Amino acid sequence: MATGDERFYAEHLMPTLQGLLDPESAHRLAVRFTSLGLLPFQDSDMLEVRVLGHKFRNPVGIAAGFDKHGEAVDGLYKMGFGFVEIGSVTPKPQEGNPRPRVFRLPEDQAVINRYGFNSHGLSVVEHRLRARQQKQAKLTEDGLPLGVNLGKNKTSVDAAEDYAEGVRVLGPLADYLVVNVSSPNTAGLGKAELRRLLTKVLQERDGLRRVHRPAVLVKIAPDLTSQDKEDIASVVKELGIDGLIVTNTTVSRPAGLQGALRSETGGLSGKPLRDLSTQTIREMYALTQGRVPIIGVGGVSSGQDALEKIRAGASLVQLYTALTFWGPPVVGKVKRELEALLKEQGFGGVTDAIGADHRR
Ligand SMILES: Cc1cc2nc3c(=O)[nH]c(=O)nc-3n(C[C@H](O)[C@H](O)[C@H](O)COP(=O)(O)O)c2cc1C
Ligand SMILES: Cc1c(-c2ccc(-c3ccccc3)cc2)nc2ccc(F)cc2c1C(=O)O
Ligand SMILES: CCCCCCCCCC[N+](C)(C)[O-]
Ligand SMILES: O=C(O)c1cc(=O)[nH]c(=O)[nH]1
């Protein structure tokens, strides 16, 4: 419990917790324990990455959706993540979907969720981040940046204005902001319309004072058509979007899922998403000519999984579902395995491996 023993968590503690608790209850408990620092690897120079205007001490981040309301940021750095992304946060508070809304697929090492952007709202999260704003400035300077993922309310009549409000309220507190094209669990969340939305978002970001001006990334689904991907790549290049987060959960249900709950509505995460996500990274890296930083996300639970996404074009990776199965020790596991594989494959560090598959 205190050592951080990978086997004890993976074989005993986490499975026991999952047998006692429904997944939303376990999620809530995890956020509470993490926020108190009740947690069980030394980052080497090989893992440092410079992207998005920032130093990242290691390339392994916690994906959006774990700390939706910015309650456990410091605990997540204590867990060993190189960067933390909170959210999604919506402008007004909203409850999200009725419970149950989170479903485990243990036989698939996967989860399906339909949280529906449950959020404390911008004002609450703003005041929470302001309470530790200088602590975060020091963490960022130390190579531990903070991302904020912005969502839209269910009953909003103007999606672009919801995102613009997010930029104005939490932009000044973030190293990067994220706008999803891609929750599966809201509404209808042409190319001119993404262009319209992102133009407004970037105008709002550009209007912030320079020390308070975050990078802006777009987070995309794994379920896009070839046309959608080409169009996104074009708009990102046209507008100078700073980066992409690839990918959110999938609304597909790959052949072979075994879990009893496989036909629940929602986004699927974890192992069944992994290679769909890696392939989407590969495609977006090629379409953007390797000039647009990608954060690769979807089914990362080992160093091999991380390095496959880096070699496909990711500069940084995130994980979430692996934490739910294997617990806090998975972060150091991924970092240790990634360092070993980098050495084994002749890379001087992470930076040298970014996009390496495209050069072979
Ligand atoms: C329970 C849960 C809630 C999520 N909530 C959000 C969210 O609010 N915003 C977001 O951008 N992604 C959200 N995601 C997606 C994750 O950030 C991530 O893109 C996806 O789960 C794939 O990574 P993984 O396979 O490592 O979990 C959520 C995922 C899960 C499992
Ligand atoms: C177990 C779990 C956890 C979790 C993570 C970390 C920890 C943990 C343990 C020790 C210290 C800190 C944290 C405990 C529990 N978080 C989730 C998040 C979302 C979700 F959908 C499901 C879960 C689930 C689940 O499958 O029931
Ligand atoms: C979220 C419930 C997890 C239950 C057990 C969590 C382990 C406590 C960590 C122990 N310790 C702080 C001392 O390292
Ligand atoms: O809140 C949610 O349902 C949610 C949002 C998102 O972006 N992705 C996801 O899988 N769930």
mmCIF file of all heavy atoms in Angstrom, residues 304-324:
data_model
loop_
_atom_site.group_PDB
_atom_site.id
_atom_site.type_symbol
_atom_site.label_atom_id
_atom_site.label_comp_id
_atom_site.label_asym_id
_atom_site.label_seq_id
_atom_site.Cartn_x
_atom_site.Cartn_y
_atom_site.Cartn_z
ATOM 1 N N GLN A 304 5.534 -0.158 -23.709
ATOM 2 C CA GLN A 304 5.366 -0.448 -25.132
ATOM 3 C C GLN A 304 4.209 0.347 -25.708
ATOM 4 O O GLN A 304 4.319 0.925 -26.796
ATOM 5 C CB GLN A 304 5.146 -1.955 -25.355
ATOM 6 C CG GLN A 304 4.809 -2.247 -26.810
ATOM 7 C CD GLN A 304 4.630 -3.711 -27.132
ATOM 8 O OE1 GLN A 304 5.520 -4.536 -26.897
ATOM 9 N NE2 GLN A 304 3.461 -4.044 -27.678
ATOM 10 N N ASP A 305 3.085 0.398 -24.987
ATOM 11 C CA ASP A 305 1.950 1.149 -25.512
ATOM 12 C C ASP A 305 2.319 2.616 -25.684
ATOM 13 O O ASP A 305 1.970 3.236 -26.691
ATOM 14 C CB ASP A 305 0.744 1.043 -24.579
ATOM 15 C CG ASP A 305 0.273 -0.354 -24.295
ATOM 16 O OD1 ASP A 305 0.518 -1.283 -25.098
ATOM 17 O OD2 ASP A 305 -0.374 -0.568 -23.252
ATOM 18 N N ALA A 306 3.010 3.190 -24.701
ATOM 19 C CA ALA A 306 3.429 4.591 -24.813
ATOM 20 C C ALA A 306 4.365 4.820 -25.982
ATOM 21 O O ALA A 306 4.177 5.740 -26.792
ATOM 22 C CB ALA A 306 4.101 4.990 -23.496
ATOM 23 N N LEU A 307 5.366 3.952 -26.128
ATOM 24 C CA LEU A 307 6.338 4.155 -27.206
ATOM 25 C C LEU A 307 5.731 3.926 -28.573
ATOM 26 O O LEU A 307 6.083 4.616 -29.529
ATOM 27 C CB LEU A 307 7.541 3.229 -26.997
ATOM 28 C CG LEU A 307 8.680 3.409 -28.006
ATOM 29 C CD1 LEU A 307 9.167 4.845 -28.040
ATOM 30 C CD2 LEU A 307 9.812 2.460 -27.643
ATOM 31 N N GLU A 308 4.721 3.049 -28.687
ATOM 32 C CA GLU A 308 4.062 2.899 -29.983
ATOM 33 C C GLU A 308 3.387 4.199 -30.389
ATOM 34 O O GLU A 308 3.419 4.602 -31.552
ATOM 35 C CB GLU A 308 3.030 1.771 -29.965
ATOM 36 C CG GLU A 308 3.735 0.409 -30.028
ATOM 37 C CD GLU A 308 2.808 -0.756 -30.226
ATOM 38 O OE1 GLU A 308 1.582 -0.584 -30.095
ATOM 39 O OE2 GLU A 308 3.335 -1.870 -30.466
ATOM 40 N N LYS A 309 2.751 4.869 -29.421
ATOM 41 C CA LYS A 309 2.129 6.149 -29.754
ATOM 42 C C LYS A 309 3.142 7.245 -30.043
ATOM 43 O O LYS A 309 2.934 8.031 -30.973
ATOM 44 C CB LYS A 309 1.174 6.564 -28.625
ATOM 45 C CG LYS A 309 -0.122 5.752 -28.702
ATOM 46 C CD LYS A 309 -1.083 6.205 -27.615
ATOM 47 C CE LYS A 309 -2.488 5.698 -27.831
ATOM 48 N NZ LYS A 309 -2.627 4.256 -28.122
ATOM 49 N N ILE A 310 4.245 7.290 -29.320
ATOM 50 C CA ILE A 310 5.310 8.262 -29.592
ATOM 51 C C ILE A 310 5.883 8.041 -30.975
ATOM 52 O O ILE A 310 5.991 8.970 -31.785
ATOM 53 C CB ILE A 310 6.362 8.183 -28.478
ATOM 54 C CG1 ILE A 310 5.742 8.689 -27.176
ATOM 55 C CG2 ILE A 310 7.616 8.985 -28.811
ATOM 56 C CD1 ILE A 310 6.529 8.305 -25.943
ATOM 57 N N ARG A 311 6.211 6.785 -31.299
ATOM 58 C CA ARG A 311 6.754 6.493 -32.626
ATOM 59 C C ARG A 311 5.772 6.811 -33.733
ATOM 60 O O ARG A 311 6.155 7.143 -34.853
ATOM 61 C CB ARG A 311 7.203 5.033 -32.707
ATOM 62 C CG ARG A 311 8.398 4.703 -31.828
ATOM 63 C CD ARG A 311 8.817 3.235 -31.948
ATOM 64 N NE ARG A 311 9.144 3.008 -33.340
ATOM 65 C CZ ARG A 311 10.265 2.523 -33.842
ATOM 66 N NH1 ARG A 311 11.258 2.120 -33.064
ATOM 67 N NH2 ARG A 311 10.347 2.458 -35.165
ATOM 68 N N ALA A 312 4.472 6.718 -33.466
ATOM 69 C CA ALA A 312 3.450 7.051 -34.440
ATOM 70 C C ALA A 312 3.259 8.553 -34.605
ATOM 71 O O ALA A 312 2.576 8.959 -35.539
ATOM 72 C CB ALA A 312 2.118 6.408 -34.068
ATOM 73 N N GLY A 313 3.818 9.347 -33.692
ATOM 74 C CA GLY A 313 3.754 10.789 -33.829
ATOM 75 C C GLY A 313 3.400 11.538 -32.560
ATOM 76 O O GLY A 313 3.395 12.772 -32.641
ATOM 77 N N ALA A 314 3.142 10.867 -31.448
ATOM 78 C CA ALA A 314 2.820 11.639 -30.241
ATOM 79 C C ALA A 314 4.065 12.207 -29.575
ATOM 80 O O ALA A 314 5.050 11.508 -29.393
ATOM 81 C CB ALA A 314 2.070 10.761 -29.259
ATOM 82 N N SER A 315 3.974 13.471 -29.145
ATOM 83 C CA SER A 315 5.031 14.056 -28.335
ATOM 84 C C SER A 315 4.884 13.750 -26.861
ATOM 85 O O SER A 315 5.856 13.760 -26.114
ATOM 86 C CB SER A 315 5.060 15.577 -28.524
ATOM 87 O OG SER A 315 5.462 15.942 -29.838
ATOM 88 N N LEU A 316 3.649 13.532 -26.421
ATOM 89 C CA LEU A 316 3.302 13.225 -25.051
ATOM 90 C C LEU A 316 2.186 12.177 -25.078
ATOM 91 O O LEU A 316 1.565 12.036 -26.136
ATOM 92 C CB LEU A 316 2.747 14.458 -24.324
ATOM 93 C CG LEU A 316 3.637 15.699 -24.229
ATOM 94 C CD1 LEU A 316 2.791 16.892 -23.812
ATOM 95 C CD2 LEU A 316 4.759 15.455 -23.243
ATOM 96 N N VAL A 317 2.018 11.414 -24.002
ATOM 97 C CA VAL A 317 0.886 10.486 -23.957
ATOM 98 C C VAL A 317 0.084 10.718 -22.686
ATOM 99 O O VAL A 317 0.575 11.318 -21.740
ATOM 100 C CB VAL A 317 1.313 9.009 -23.984
ATOM 101 C CG1 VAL A 317 2.060 8.713 -25.287
ATOM 102 C CG2 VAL A 317 2.173 8.627 -22.796
ATOM 103 N N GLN A 318 -1.159 10.255 -22.665
ATOM 104 C CA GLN A 318 -1.930 10.239 -21.433
ATOM 105 C C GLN A 318 -2.505 8.849 -21.191
ATOM 106 O O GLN A 318 -2.637 8.070 -22.142
ATOM 107 C CB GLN A 318 -3.089 11.226 -21.446
ATOM 108 C CG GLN A 318 -2.668 12.675 -21.632
ATOM 109 C CD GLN A 318 -3.849 13.585 -21.868
ATOM 110 O OE1 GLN A 318 -4.790 13.242 -22.575
ATOM 111 N NE2 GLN A 318 -3.818 14.769 -21.258
ATOM 112 N N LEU A 319 -2.826 8.572 -19.928
ATOM 113 C CA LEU A 319 -3.589 7.358 -19.650
ATOM 114 C C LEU A 319 -4.680 7.673 -18.641
ATOM 115 O O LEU A 319 -4.596 8.680 -17.934
ATOM 116 C CB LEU A 319 -2.687 6.231 -19.143
ATOM 117 C CG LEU A 319 -1.881 6.499 -17.867
ATOM 118 C CD1 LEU A 319 -2.704 6.232 -16.617
ATOM 119 C CD2 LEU A 319 -0.637 5.626 -17.846
ATOM 120 N N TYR A 320 -5.689 6.832 -18.634
ATOM 121 C CA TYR A 320 -6.742 6.894 -17.621
ATOM 122 C C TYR A 320 -7.166 5.483 -17.261
ATOM 123 O O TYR A 320 -6.954 5.053 -16.122
ATOM 124 C CB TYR A 320 -7.897 7.723 -18.148
ATOM 125 C CG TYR A 320 -9.054 7.985 -17.212
ATOM 126 C CD1 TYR A 320 -9.984 8.948 -17.594
ATOM 127 C CD2 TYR A 320 -9.242 7.330 -16.009
ATOM 128 C CE1 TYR A 320 -11.088 9.207 -16.813
ATOM 129 C CE2 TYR A 320 -10.334 7.610 -15.210
ATOM 130 C CZ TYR A 320 -11.248 8.550 -15.614
ATOM 131 O OH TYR A 320 -12.330 8.826 -14.808
ATOM 132 N N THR A 321 -7.731 4.728 -18.203
ATOM 133 C CA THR A 321 -8.300 3.421 -17.851
ATOM 134 C C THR A 321 -7.296 2.497 -17.203
ATOM 135 O O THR A 321 -7.653 1.810 -16.233
ATOM 136 C CB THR A 321 -8.935 2.788 -19.096
ATOM 137 O OG1 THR A 321 -9.968 3.676 -19.548
ATOM 138 C CG2 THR A 321 -9.567 1.450 -18.771
ATOM 139 N N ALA A 322 -6.019 2.550 -17.573
ATOM 140 C CA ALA A 322 -5.010 1.726 -16.921
ATOM 141 C C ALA A 322 -4.904 2.000 -15.435
ATOM 142 O O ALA A 322 -4.603 1.083 -14.668
ATOM 143 C CB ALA A 322 -3.644 1.943 -17.558
ATOM 144 N N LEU A 323 -5.080 3.240 -15.005
ATOM 145 C CA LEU A 323 -5.079 3.579 -13.588
ATOM 146 C C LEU A 323 -6.193 2.865 -12.850
ATOM 147 O O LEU A 323 -6.013 2.450 -11.699
ATOM 148 C CB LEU A 323 -5.248 5.097 -13.449
ATOM 149 C CG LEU A 323 -5.258 5.631 -12.015
ATOM 150 C CD1 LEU A 323 -3.898 5.493 -11.375
ATOM 151 C CD2 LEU A 323 -5.665 7.097 -11.988
ATOM 152 N N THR A 324 -7.344 2.699 -13.496
ATOM 153 C CA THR A 324 -8.489 2.062 -12.864
ATOM 154 C C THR A 324 -8.281 0.580 -12.637
ATOM 155 O O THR A 324 -8.823 0.004 -11.693
ATOM 156 C CB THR A 324 -9.795 2.284 -13.642
ATOM 157 O OG1 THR A 324 -9.856 1.425 -14.796
ATOM 158 C CG2 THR A 324 -9.958 3.722 -14.084
#
